[PDB]
Structures are given as structure tokens and as C-alpha cells.
Amino acid sequence: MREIVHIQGGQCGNQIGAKFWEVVSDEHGIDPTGTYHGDSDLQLERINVYFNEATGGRYVPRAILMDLEPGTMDSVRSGPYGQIFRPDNFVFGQTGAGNNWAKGHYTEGAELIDSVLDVVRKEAESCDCLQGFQVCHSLGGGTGSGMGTLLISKIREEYPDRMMLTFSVVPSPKVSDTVVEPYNATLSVHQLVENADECMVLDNEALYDICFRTLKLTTPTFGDLNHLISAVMSGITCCLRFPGQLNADLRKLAVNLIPFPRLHFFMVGFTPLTSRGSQQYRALTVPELTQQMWDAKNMMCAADPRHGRYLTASALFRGRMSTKEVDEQMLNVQNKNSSYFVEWIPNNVKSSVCDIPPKGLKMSATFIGNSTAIQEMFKRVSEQFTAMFRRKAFLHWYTGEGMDEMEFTEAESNMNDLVSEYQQYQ
Amino acid sequence: REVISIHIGQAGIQVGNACWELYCLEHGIQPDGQMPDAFNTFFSETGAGKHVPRCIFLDLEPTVVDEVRTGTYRQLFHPEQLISGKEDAANNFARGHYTIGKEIVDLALDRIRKLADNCTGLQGFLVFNAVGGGTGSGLGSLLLERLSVDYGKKSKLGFTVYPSPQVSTAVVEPYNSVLSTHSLLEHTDVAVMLDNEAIYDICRRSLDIERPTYTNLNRLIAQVISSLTASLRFDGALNVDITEFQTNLVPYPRIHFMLSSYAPIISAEKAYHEQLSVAEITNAAFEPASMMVKCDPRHGKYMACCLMYRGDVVPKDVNASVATIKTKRTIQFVDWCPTGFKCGINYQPPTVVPGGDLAKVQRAVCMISNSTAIGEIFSRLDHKFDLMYAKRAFVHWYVGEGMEEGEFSEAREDLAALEKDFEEVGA
Amino acid sequence: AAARERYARKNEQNELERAFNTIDSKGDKKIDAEELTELFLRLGHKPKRGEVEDMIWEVDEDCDGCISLLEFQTLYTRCRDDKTGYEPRGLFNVVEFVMNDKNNQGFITLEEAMQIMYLRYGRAELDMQLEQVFGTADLNSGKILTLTEFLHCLHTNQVKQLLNRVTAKT
Amino acid sequence: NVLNKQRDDTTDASRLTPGELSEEQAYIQQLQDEMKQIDEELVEAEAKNR
Ligand SMILES: Nc1nc2c(ncn2[C@@H]2O[C@H](COP(=O)(O)OP(=O)(O)OP(=O)(O)O)[C@@H](O)[C@H]2O)c(=O)[nH]1
């Protein structure tokens, strides 16, 4: 029916998506060789959203891997569920950006994104009625930020009346891998404010604290973080793949959650998330799900909403549940903590239910809250960017490649008006 | 992706003898050149099962080259690669740059061209030289001049040996270092300093070797290079390339001088009684008791740092460890840079070579940082170079070769100008 | 604003009848696509490959093929009161030009009379349809009126409200 | 002998110097003109559809 193509950029995007296709294929019962082995008819009836039957029970994922280094692509086909992707979908450069956003947006982008667009165009016309596009990338890298950024801009010029998601991890001062993170973040977000339909703000700090306290893991490699992110992404699209009492497509959530067109950066959470010592001691009820859902520490972004107010919030529930519990729980969590919600919008929480849980659990949830606390992140990177730019450090790879001085001044100005308009609407 | 490594001078090709030794012992190749795909960055395959390194040894004196022609690796190196002159520059920068250099560097160039042509995705070059001599200084700078005009956009990793402050073997080396830096400044993209007294102190204290020769020095240098190319050779949880250091570590096109260090340099006995984890090696990479250049970053301020991690290392603790470093106050970063780190983790541990004095360690860290303590060393060189230049000692040899008094004064004021440049960025 | 329009119609009706006969070249009541090219040649403008077919297509809506004087008044009135109709105006312009012509090369200051009748508008709005200035006159022809009117209608048509909307500030 | 060797190298160096490709730059220029023509052609057609 409605179809979503998948686009993974850079190293972070590629590895996030690899675990994503593994988890999804397990939900629909496709083995790593790409054949159907499920039992229920509910699994076979909605695999056209993410796959195409090739020949004789061969279901291939509708995904496009794109980056600038061969190591990532080889690491995809090596691991399991690596043999399911069509090899033509490996659009692929060779030289590399080197964490230089200009090289990802002006130097190397000019020779790859045309090739990327051919594969993307083929995957859009391969399906009938597009629901939207799904892009997983970072904001601190070069080949994920710049390459994915220019791709997003060109795509919105081609298919403008279609939805678009960008799952993006953002950098933070405590988890600081690259040195030019602020230059990449502020310019990348400057493009996201005018191109993306809605963006989902992620960051690595929150992922580390989820695996520290909630999951109580000892050695949380990147496989577990990608495992966490994949559960959230599968949750946002369960409504398209399984029937339920209250369905909510991507368009339904965006039109309902975004009160003003430029304010489309979200904070995400997921429930339930429990450690192996406490997976036995818990119950599975809607209120138990709700408090662990709205918890401050359980946000999958390191921006505490309790420093500000909620504008809108959304809940996507999965499993056999009673809709009265759904509605009364949203009403109670809004009445006790009444100051944390915006005032000139009553009933700031939209909720929906789907009748198919993730495999291995009786009942789960997914939270999408559009709060006003996100301006902290924009200031936290803006001051670092201004601190660097007022002495032109690290600028010659930017100005020597094609940027001028006015682009950084444009970035600050757009940065400053967005944090100012967040401040007004709060 | 490929990178070729060129070696100039007595110290240069001796360093190569340890590097290619380490390489074949890591990729399981016998010294004759046959296995009993990741080797593609350094070795090209004949197609008959023989692997040949991407390297050219060249110098002006045939002594150090011809023991290599008859060691164990007689059959590993292609004969044309091992270039050799007929007579030495003899610790005379001008003699290596104008008299004898002008005949030998053109042969090296039309050789290095077909090494690059055999390559496909050339990442860059990386050069090895000691500035105290005449070959590594003179034709080294001449070779870098002609390399910049040929390629330009390709990285040129200069792993240079600067003369030690107090421990020195030659007497005209202050002249050679100043004139060489004058061109190493505007040609090398990323130039790493490797002193000799610092490596001497590491082998004395850490390796507890009280009688070290040049063999152990070259051994640990190869270890740092191996730790730096593992990200290019092998896959890790978080990798970087050689084009990453060009952007992430040098804020201005003339400030490219990095302090290197490595950890843990530990003997065979401490490892048995001691514990290895990520936090303590993240600490040990920063203390000045493990640096490779006699300077103190405690006197300077950091611009940006880089961290190679090898072995069984997860990414959660490298972040936690670098966080603990920033919250400490013994070392401080420049005001303009809020974030000053570039981290990287790779899966393969460092292999060991039999006969070396490096233990088999479970994990290791290779740190490459940039600071302003490097400004103190350059100033320290200027005092004793200017000390003798005014009275015109030893000038008659260089000017007799065909130079004049002009290039001393103009090279002197250029590096003097660099002193002022370092002081103004630190403020 | 009605008085300007009613008075204008009272006088232009007689001009219109002769304008019609003059456009016809066969001495009949029907205006063929053939005649339109002849008229443009008189104006001194050239049609494109398919312009005439569109011109004949859009105007006629009670029968198919050639046009008739009855269709012509229907067109005239609908287009004249069309203002917020977003309706076609391909063949209205050529006839209004011919009627507003009495010099047999075009008209100069009479654009303002055309403009005021449509709306009082503004001197700046006049600087939109063409570049005429109050003191200076110009030479004009068929070429420079039809093209500018056609382009203006395309320019207004494009603008619509998607994310171009602007709400009062908080 | 050495003068002749040097002279040949200069002649080789002069041959190698990149030279402007007239037969190809004009192609690029003509391609951009047709591209821009189609953009304006496209906007009129979109107007017609509305
Ligand atoms: N670190 C290190 N330095 C060395 C080694 N061998 C020589 N050197 C240094 O090289 C410097 C002199 O240059 P050499 O490489 O020996 O000689 P050269 O550079 O070829 O110059 P010429 O003697 O004129 O040929 C000395 O100051 C030493 O410090 C070595 O094995 N390890």
C-alpha cells in the first residue's frame, strides 16, 4: 500500500540501518537468506511497505546505503542479514570527506548525489503511492551530515508533497569525538530547518545513560545503541504494517504534532526498557508503561523537558490494550503536572494504539514529544560555533573549498532566530 | 586505498628496516615474500603469490643501503626501490640541497611516479627523515618541494627527527635544522616531531633498558606507525583516515607540528603484575614522562588532540576517560576551542615481533596532539643557531658550495616570524 | 466604482461592433483561427506553433470550432467582470488592444484609462504591467502589450499560500 | 649534451601544460542554455495546469 524507502548515510547511518533491517525482518518472519517462513497471514499482507518480492519467495529490503568509505559497506555484507540487500543499491564513493562538511556538501557531493538520486528515483517509482522517505544520519560527521543534507534538499525539490523523516544523532560537549562538531552541527541544522518535514533529535549521551541505569549493561557496544534506536524507528511505522483500534500514519502525527512549520525537532523515548534482573519483577499495564514512558531520564535525547514546557506530545502503543486506559492515562499525566504543558492548546497529547506487539514482549510503547526545552541544544552548540568563528579557527578548509564568510553569518542568524522563536512560542 | 612510504638518509632507511619487519610479521608474510586482502594498502601483489612493499629507500651513502640488500629481506624489496648514491652530503645542508641533491632527486621522482601509478585510491605519502643530517635535511626539503608541485592535494605525513636539545652527535646541526624547517614549514601538510632524548628516556625508564642502541628506538617508532595505520588497514568500531588529521588537528596552515606519544610501553615483567584498561592508558598517554619530544605541554596550551586506541576497547569508556581529562585542570585547552579531541578505536591489537623488547599487551593508545610547547623548542633552537652565526663560523662550507649570506638571514627571519605567530595564537 | 465601468461599456459597445467586423476578413460573423494570425500581423506580433489553437479553444464554450459574435460578447462580459475569477484571458487582450487602438500602431497614455477603469490601483502598480513613466511617452506595438499582460497573469497565478502564510506574532 | 637534455625536458614540459578545450567549453555553455530554456518552459506549463 503506502511505501517508505530507506536511505542510510555515512558510517553511523549504515550501522544503524543494518540492525534496523535485522529487527524488521524478524518481525515479518524473513530468514537471513531472504525467504518467507512465517505462519500468520498478518505478516504476509503488509510487507509491500518495506520489501519487494523478487522471484520465488525472495523479499529484498527497500533500502539504499550511501557513504564515502568502503569499510562500512563491507562491514554490512559481512554480518548476517547482509546478503539480503540488492547490490545495486550500494551507491558508493571512494575518496572520503574527512569530517569536512564542505567536502561532503560541495566537493565530493557533486559527484555522488546524482548517482544516489538515480537509485532513490528508481525506488520511488518502483512503488505506487509513497508515504514518505526515511533518512538515518548524524550531525557531527562529514559524509553523514553534508552528504545526507544535500540529498535531503534535492529530494524535497523533486517530491515536495511527500513526508520525510530524518533520524539524526547530534553532538554534545561531553561526548565529543570530532573537533569541528559545532561547524558541522550549526550548518547542518541550518539546512534541516528549511528542508526536512520533521526531524527526530537524537544524541549519544542519552544512549549511554539508558544503557547505564535502565538497561544496566556492562559492555554496551554500538550494537546495543543501534538496537535501541531500531526499536524506536519500528514503533513509528507499526501503524502502517498492522491494523489496530486507533491507527496513526506518519502524516497524521506530523499534522497533529507540529503547531508551527519551522518547529519540527522532536524528543523520543521508548517503553518498556528493563534490565534482566527486573524483567521478571515487573507488571505490564498501561499506567506502568506511561510513567516509565514520560520519565525524564528515559528520554532518548539529553535535553530534559522538565526545564521547559511541552508544546505537543504523542504516544504510539502496541499490543492488546483497552483504549479507555490509553485516554485516561494521558489525561491524568497532564492534570497533575499541569505547569509542564503549554496552556493555549488543550489536550496537548495525541495517542494511538496498534494491536501487534514487538516479538518477545507482551506490550510496548513509543513516545514522541515536541517540547520547548530543545533550545538548550541549539544554544549549547551555537556559543561553541561563535567561539570558534570569531578567530577563524579551522576555517581554511571551509573557505578554501567554497564557503564564504556570509554563510557562517547566515548560519548564526538562522540559529539565533530559531532559538528566539522557540522562546516566543513557549 | 594505498599509502606509500619514502625513507631518506641513514636514520630514514634504518627506521624503514624496523617498519617493514613489523609489517610482514603482522600480516604473516615470510621475509622472502610469500604467504605460507588488508595487506593491499602497503604490499602490491605480483600475481605469482609474491608481495612487494610500497617503499623506496634512498640516500647518498651506499653503506647503510647495502647491508639491507643482504640481510634477511634481500628478496622482499624490489631492487629498483633501494636507491643509493655514490658519496655523502656529509652533514652539510647546502651540499645535499644544491650540489649532490640535484643529481639524485630526479631519479627518485621518476621512480615514485610509477609507485603512485600502480596505486588506485592513493591516500597520500609519508616521509621519514632526520633533520640533523645533510641527506635527510637537504634533498629531503628538495624532494618535498618537487612533491608539492607534483601532487599538492595529497597528504605528506612527515615523521621527522629533530635534534635533541642537549644530546647531539653533530656540531653544524643547528644550521641544518633552521634552514630545513624554512621549507618543511610550507610543504609538509602534517609534520610529527620525534626527538631522540625523549625516546632515550622512555627506553631507560619504561622499558627499563639501561643500554639501548638505535634498534629499540626504531622498533617503537614502527609501533606508533602501525598503531596509526591500523585504522586504514583494519576495521574498528570507530575509524579515521589519514585525511582526517589534515582537518581535525591543525587550526592554521602554518601551525602543523604534533607531539606524539604511545602507551603502554611496558616491559615483559610489569605487564604480568599490572592491569590494562582504557582509563589508565588514556591517562598515561598525556603525562610528559611518555612523550617523544623534549618539551612540556604543561607549559603550553592545547589546540586539538588525537587518540588512537587498539585492541579490546569499547567506545563507552574512551568517552568517559577523555571526559575525566577535560575536567582536570593540569592541562588546559585554547579559549577558541571548546572541544579539543579526535578519538578513534580499532579492533586489532598490536602484534609483537620476536627479538623486540615490547611485551604482548592487551590494549594500547597512540596519542597525537598539537600544542604550544612546540614553540619553546623552536625558540631554543634559535638561541644556539644565532649564537654562532654572528661570528660566521662554519658558514664558509655552505657558501663555498654555492650559497650566500642572504639565505641565512632570510631563513632566520622566517622562522623568527614563526615564533611571533605561535605566541599570538596562544593568546 | 460602478460608474466608471457602466459609462465605459456605454461608449465601447459601438467601438466593439466595428472592432469585430474589422477583425473578420471574410465579411461574415465567424472569426476563424486564420483571421487571428492576420490580425497579429497587423499588430506586428507573431504567434507560436500552438498559440492560435489555445486562443480558439479557451474562448468558445457553448459549441466547438470557430467563434461567433454571441460567444464574443459572452467572453467580453465574463472577462471584464472576471477580476477575482482566475479565468482565461487569451483572446480578450487582442480585442481590447484593437478597440483601444485608434492610431494603428498601438496606444500610449490610454493604458492609464484602461488601468483606472479596471481599478484606481497605483503608479507603482502601473510600473508593474509596463515601464511607462508619467512624463515620458514611448512608442508601443502589439508585441509589448500582449506579452506583458500574459506574463502578469502567469505571475499572479503562481503565488499561493503553502508555507508562505504569515501569522501575527505572539 | 647536457644542454640538449635540458632543452628536450623544457619542450616536454611546455607540451604538457593544460590548454583550454574550445570544442568542449562551448558544448558546456550550450548545454546550460538549453537547461535554462527548459526551466522557463516548465513554469509556463505548470501555470497552465493550475
Ligand atoms: N631516532 C633515531 N635517530 C637516528 C638513528 N640513526 C641516526 N639518527 C639521527 O640522525 C642524525 C644524523 O643524520 P643521519 O640520518 O644519521 O645521517 P643523514 O641524515 O643521512 O646525513 P649524512 O650523514 O650526511 O648522510 C643524528 O643526529 C641521529 O640523531 C636512529 O636509528 N634512530
Ligand SMILES: Nc1nc2c(ncn2[C@@H]2O[C@H](COP(=O)(O)OP(=O)(O)O)[C@@H](O)[C@H]2O)c(=O)[nH]1
Ligand atoms: N549509535 C551509533 N553512533 C555512532 C556509531 N558510530 C559512530 N557513531 C557516532 O557518529 C559520530 C561521528 O560520526 P561519523 O561516524 O564519523 O559519521 P560519518 O563519517 O558521516 O559516517 C559520533 O558522535 C558517534 O557518536 C554507531 O555504531 N552507533
